C-alpha cells in the first residue's frame, strides 16, 4: 500500500529517471545475473554477456512495465494482470527473486542518481517495487 507521499515520490523519481529507464532496467538485470547467478536459470535462451542486445531489450521491457505501473499506481493489479499471469502463473518465479531484481534496480538507481536518490525516494521506490513484486507474484485471475 502506497501513501500519497510514496506515489508523489515514485512519480517524481521515475520522472528524474526519464529517458534512462530502459538503460537502468538493463543494468539492473545485469547486476542481478552477476550477483545472483541463480537468477540466470530463468533466462537460459538469453545471451547474458555484458553488452547483450538481448538483455538491453528485455531491460526496456522491464522499464516500460514499471513506467506503466508508475502511471497506474492506484490500479496496478489490473494494470499488470498480463505480467502477473506471466510471472506468477506461467513462469512460477520464486518471489525471492523479485527482492533481488528490486534490490538491483535500487542499487542501479543509487549509482545513477547521486543527486536525487534521497532516503525518502529510496524508501518510496522500495515500497513501490515491493507492490509491483506482490502483484507479479500473485495469481489473482
Amino acid at each position: 500500500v502506497l501513501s500519497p507521499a510514496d506515489k508523489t515520490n515514485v512519480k517524481a523519481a521515475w520522472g528524474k529517471v526519464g529517458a534512462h529507464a530502459g538503460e537502468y532496467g538493463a543494468e539492473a538485470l545485469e547486476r542481478m545475473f552477476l550477483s545472483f547467478p541463480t537468477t540466470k536459470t530463468y533466462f537460459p535462451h538469453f545471451d547474458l554477456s555484458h553488452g547483450s542486445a538481448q538483455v538491453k531489450g528485455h531491460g526496456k521491457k522491464v522499464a516500460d512495465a514499471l513506467t506503466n505501473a508508475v502511471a497506474h499506481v492506484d490500479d496496478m493489479p489490473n494494470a499488470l494482470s498480463a505480467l502477473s499471469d506471466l510471472h506468477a502463473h506461467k513462469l512460477r518465479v520464486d518471489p525471492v527473486n523479485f527482492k533481488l531484481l528490486s534490490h538491483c534496480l535500487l542499487v542501479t538507481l543509487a549509482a545513477h542518481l547521486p543527486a536525487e536518490f534521497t532516503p525518502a525516494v529510496h524508501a518510496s521506490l522500495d515500497k513501490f517495487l515491493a507492490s509491483v513484486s506482490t502483484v507479479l507474484t500473485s495469481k489473482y485471475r
Binding site: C104, V107, F117
Partner: protein, 146 residues
C-alpha cells in the same frame, strides 16, 4: 565467503575509499527510513520521526560508525566471518532477537549506500563481490539462529 583473487582486490580497493565516519550512519540511517519497523530496536536513540531526523541523528551516526566497523573487521577476515561476528551474533540473535532477514536488509542498503557514493565505480562486478561479503556477514550474524 569466496571472493576471487581479483574480487577481494576490488572490494579492498573500494573500501579504502569509504569514509568510516559517515557511511555506517548512512546505511543504519536508511535501514530505519526504508524499513521503519527496525526503529523498534532504537527507541533510545531519540527523534527518528522523519528521514531528516533519522539521517541527522547523532546516535544513528555514532552507532552506524560501529556497524561500519564490524563490516571492516569482516573485510579483514573474509575467510572467518562467523568467527569474526560470533560476539555480535549472540547480541543480535540471543539478546536482541533481531530477525535474520533484517541482517540481510542492512547489508543491502549498505550496498545501495556504497553504490550511491561510488556511482559509476560501483560496477556490476564490483557489486557482485560486495553481495558475497554482505551475504557472508549477514549469515555470520545469524549464525546463532542455525
Amino acid at each position: 565467503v569466496h571472493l576471487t583473487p581479483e574480487e577481494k582486490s576490488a572490494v579492498t580497493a573500494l573500501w579504502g575509499k569509504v569514509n568510516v565516519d559517515e557511511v555506517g550512519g548512512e546505511a543504519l540511517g536508511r535501514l530505519l527510513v526504508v524499513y521503519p519497523w527496525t526503529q523498534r530496536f532504537f527507541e533510545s536513540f531519540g527523534d527518528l520521526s522523519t528521514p531528516d531526523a533519522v539521517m541527522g541523528n547523532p546516535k544513528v551516526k555514532a552507532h552506524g560508525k560501529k556497524v561500519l566497523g564490524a563490516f571492516s573487521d569482516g573485510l579483514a577476515h573474509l575467510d572467518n566471518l562467523k568467527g569474526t561476528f560470533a560476539t555480535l551474533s549472540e547480541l543480535h540473535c540471543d539478546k536482541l532477537h533481531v530477525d535474520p532477514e533484517n541482517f540481510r536488509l542492512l547489508g543491502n542498503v549498505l550496498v545501495c549506500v556504497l553504490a550511491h557514493h561510488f556511482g559509476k565505480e560501483f560496477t556490476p562486478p564490483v557489486q557482485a563481490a560486495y553481495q558475497k561479503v554482505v551475504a557472508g556477514v549477514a549469515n555470520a550474524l545469524a549464525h546463532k539462529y542455525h
